[PDB]
Design an enzyme around this catalytic site. Structure first.
Site, PDB file in Angstrom:
ATOM      1  N   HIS B  41      51.449  49.565  40.514  1.00 25.41           N
ATOM      2  CA  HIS B  41      50.272  48.825  40.068  1.00 25.41           C
ATOM      3  C   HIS B  41      49.489  48.205  41.212  1.00 25.41           C
ATOM      4  CE1 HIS B  41      53.023  45.172  39.988  1.00 25.41           C
ATOM      5  NE2 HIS B  41      51.945  44.662  40.560  1.00 25.41           N
ATOM      6  N   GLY B 143      51.893  37.753  44.265  1.00 24.69           N
ATOM      7  CA  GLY B 143      52.104  38.339  45.571  1.00 24.69           C
ATOM      8  C   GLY B 143      53.528  38.733  45.870  1.00 24.69           C
ATOM      9  N   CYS B 145      55.428  40.855  44.065  1.00 28.87           N
ATOM     10  CA  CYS B 145      55.865  42.173  43.619  1.00 28.87           C
ATOM     11  C   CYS B 145      56.241  43.051  44.806  1.00 28.87           C
ATOM     12  CB  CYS B 145      54.786  42.860  42.782  1.00 28.87           C
ATOM     13  SG  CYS B 145      54.592  42.110  41.174  1.00 28.87           S
TER      14      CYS B 145
HETATM   15  C1  LIG Z   1      53.115  41.129  41.213  1.00 26.38           C
HETATM   16  O1  LIG Z   1      53.008  40.448  42.427  1.00 26.38           O
HETATM   17  C2  LIG Z   1      53.076  40.161  40.031  1.00 26.38           C
HETATM   18  C3  LIG Z   1      54.347  39.291  39.945  1.00 26.38           C
HETATM   19  C4  LIG Z   1      54.142  38.221  38.821  1.00 26.38           C
HETATM   20  C5  LIG Z   1      52.997  37.290  39.184  1.00 26.38           C
HETATM   21  C6  LIG Z   1      53.505  35.909  38.738  1.00 26.38           C
HETATM   22  N1  LIG Z   1      55.038  36.050  38.632  1.00 26.38           N
HETATM   23  C7  LIG Z   1      55.395  37.338  38.684  1.00 26.38           C
HETATM   24  O2  LIG Z   1      56.504  37.745  38.620  1.00 26.38           O
HETATM   25  N2  LIG Z   1      53.007  40.983  38.839  1.00 26.38           N
HETATM   26  C8  LIG Z   1      51.985  40.912  37.993  1.00 26.38           C
HETATM   27  O3  LIG Z   1      51.089  40.153  38.184  1.00 26.38           O
HETATM   28  C9  LIG Z   1      52.015  41.819  36.760  1.00 26.38           C
HETATM   29  C10 LIG Z   1      51.122  43.044  37.015  1.00 26.38           C
HETATM   30  C11 LIG Z   1      51.025  43.950  35.785  1.00 26.38           C
HETATM   31  C12 LIG Z   1      50.047  45.080  36.112  1.00 26.38           C
HETATM   32  C13 LIG Z   1      52.381  44.554  35.446  1.00 26.38           C
HETATM   33  N3  LIG Z   1      51.561  41.086  35.592  1.00 26.38           N
HETATM   34  C14 LIG Z   1      52.158  39.972  35.170  1.00 26.38           C
HETATM   35  O4  LIG Z   1      53.205  39.594  35.620  1.00 26.38           O
HETATM   36  O5  LIG Z   1      51.544  39.269  34.235  1.00 26.38           O
HETATM   37  C15 LIG Z   1      52.258  38.147  33.787  1.00 26.38           C
HETATM   38  C16 LIG Z   1      51.928  36.875  34.584  1.00 26.38           C
HETATM   39  C17 LIG Z   1      52.543  35.679  34.228  1.00 26.38           C
HETATM   40  C18 LIG Z   1      52.265  34.507  34.928  1.00 26.38           C
HETATM   41  C19 LIG Z   1      51.363  34.526  35.991  1.00 26.38           C
HETATM   42  C20 LIG Z   1      50.738  35.721  36.349  1.00 26.38           C
HETATM   43  C21 LIG Z   1      51.024  36.891  35.648  1.00 26.38           C
END
Ligand SMILES: *[C@H](O)[C@H](C[C@@H]1CCNC1=O)NC(=O)[C@H](CC(C)C)NC(=O)OCc1ccccc1
Ligand SMILES: *[C@H](O)[C@H](C[C@@H]1CCNC1=O)NC(=O)[C@H](CC(C)C)NC(=O)OCc1ccccc1
Lengths: 303, 303
Positions: B41, B143, B145
């Site tokens: 992603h 950030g 991931c």
């Molecule tokens: C990748 O860096 C990020 C890790 C998330 C960001 C906050 N805590 C984490 O573990 N992943 C994502 O943003 C992910 C991307 C999708 C395309 C799979 N989406 C996601 O995690 O959404 C849920 C979320 C919850 C709380 C804050 C931000 C996003």
């Protein structure tokens, strides 16, 4: 989000760990530039350890009595010296992996990462707080002495702890890297006990702020309290008194959450007087005091 | 003695972490030999993330769209490919710090160390258990991931987890290093929930044995129970059933302590039915299930 007890990445310290053998005693040493630091009781024997005179014991040693091993490479010892409770062994090679470093002494209530080591080889990493009674609650077996504790700040490693011994209650004691003990302990095999401990109030409040930042709010209330009225409750429950500097240190967390420190102190008062009634905070049924305000800000500012 | 939740030393993995940028999206990658692995992603935009078609999105990319940075050195991407939910970027340089490694998939109930990273830079290390519902309870911000989870066995790093997302309950989900998700989750920004969880019974018993090895004995009793009668209680309290293989895995701890597994199961039954009555076990007021029998043996055999 999420809040976890977290160690610093240990690579920079792993590159400094060596094995130090003297006689039948083997433990760990810390190799920085061309000096290896280790606990001086490596020079003791089974019978020396009841009440050794270390100045006598060291005078009777020479460089060839110390076997230093950095992995498979044996390091040649070209000088030895005592600094308080640590031994400094000068070797013929500067450690090519020496990071930027400092020797710092920490205060009770502060945290650091421990790299547990055996026979010069790192085995695991975890966080410890220096208790008010100058002990730490660690995990150390025979052969772990010379394992070090440290913090990292912008690729500079601040070394603050070297491990020396275990007390009868199962807690652990050691020195700074100048070889000066934390607390009223000595490096000999006699009856030693830690003084009474107390709970680190400012850390508990920092962890309560971490809880709110992560969505745990059930313990919040509309009340505020005064610093004096809180400290009356703190004394009853064996908590350290809260000072205006502690309120100030908590300022940033107070701002991020919009909950004033004395507002959170009312929550802590009710938690102390009433318990949790079966609920948990960040997965704990007990109030946690091993996270500093800095530890909390480190994980929670992005939420 | 002492028992602490402990991560593996992270040096070998720190030498593999790089930064991967595509468009305005930056996350972490894992550089082994001449391939960088990262969550696919990274190629999404803010609007792509609701329901992306990744095959379409990748076909529209070329090598020059990926900026890889190993510290200050920029790595040139010479090939790109998708493997399930991970992207593989071939680069013009083999990582000189590549350790002996394997890609393994772990089972619920097993643990691993997480090296949390941001912008290619490690920030902290901690232990996680794969829950029965295929989530982990971690600490991850934007950030993070591409941060990976791993175990170490005789200088061989077994990679088992790459981080992809956070669920609404605050728990975390990701893939193995083949890019196959743990659990019934997908890498898009929609409503996803973890199934109901259960408590890992064999781990709780392992932690009870750690408690005894470290001198906590107050919960022991003279009674034994049968596997069937224990599992009736387990079902009531949302604990996994205990199998004969679990009794066998606990054998070594049973031997070291002289407490048969079904003897310890009677303790756990009474703890479940009566609570702790204000006491603690290894400093916990709750029964802990994130330590495997292996984790316990690793710290307790020398006691
Ligand atoms: C990748 O860096 C990020 C890790 C998330 C960001 C906050 N805590 C984490 O573990 N992943 C994502 O943003 C992910 C991307 C999708 C395309 C799979 N989406 C996601 O995690 O959404 C849920 C979320 C919850 C709380 C804050 C931000 C996003
Ligand atoms: C040094 O490797 C060792 C670390 C101890 C061993 C068990 N857990 C630890 O933290 N230190 C000593 O053995 C120390 C040496 C004296 C000369 C200071 N003595 C000591 O810790 O005695 C207490 C003890 C308790 C439980 C098991 C073994 C020793």
């Amino acid at each position: 989000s999420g809040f976890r007890k977290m160690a610093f990445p240990s690579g920079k310290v792993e590159g400094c760990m060596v094995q130090v053998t003297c006689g039948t005693t083997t433990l760990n040493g810390l190799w920085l530039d061309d000096v290896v630091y280790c606990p001086r009781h490596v020079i003791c024997t089974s019978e020396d350890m009841l009440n050794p005179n270390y100045e006598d014991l060291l005078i009777r040693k020479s460089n060839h009595n110390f076997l230093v091993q950095a992995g498979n490479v044996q390091l040649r010892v070209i000088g030895h010296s005592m600094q308080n409770c640590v031994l400094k062994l000068k070797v013929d090679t500067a450690n090519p992996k020496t990071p930027k470093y400092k020797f710092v002494r920490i205060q009770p209530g502060q945290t650091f990462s421990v790299l547990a080591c055996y026979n010069g080889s790192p085995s695991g990493v975890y966080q410890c707080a220096m208790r008010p009674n100058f002990t730490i609650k660690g995990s150390f077996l025979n052969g772990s002495c010379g394992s070090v504790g440290f913090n990292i700040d912008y690729d500079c490693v601040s070394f603050c702890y070297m491990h020396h011994m275990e007390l009868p209650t199962g807690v652990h004691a050691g020195t700074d890297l100048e070889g000066n003990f934390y607390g009223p302990f000595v490096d000999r095999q006699t009856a030693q006990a830690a003084g009474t401990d107390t709970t680190i109030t400012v850390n508990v409040l920092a962890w309560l702020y971490a809880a709110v930042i992560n969505g745990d709010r059930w313990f919040l209330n509309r009340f505020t309290t005064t610093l004096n009225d809180f400290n009356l409750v703190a004394m009853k429950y064996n908590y350290e008194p809260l000072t205006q500097d502690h309120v100030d240190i908590l300022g940033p967390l107070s701002a991020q959450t919009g909950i004033a420190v004395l507002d959170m102190c009312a929550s802590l008062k009710e938690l102390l007087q009433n318990g949790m009634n079966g609920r948990t905070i960040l997965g704990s049924a007990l109030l946690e005091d091993e996270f500093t305000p800095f530890d909390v800000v480190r994980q929670c500012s992005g939420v």
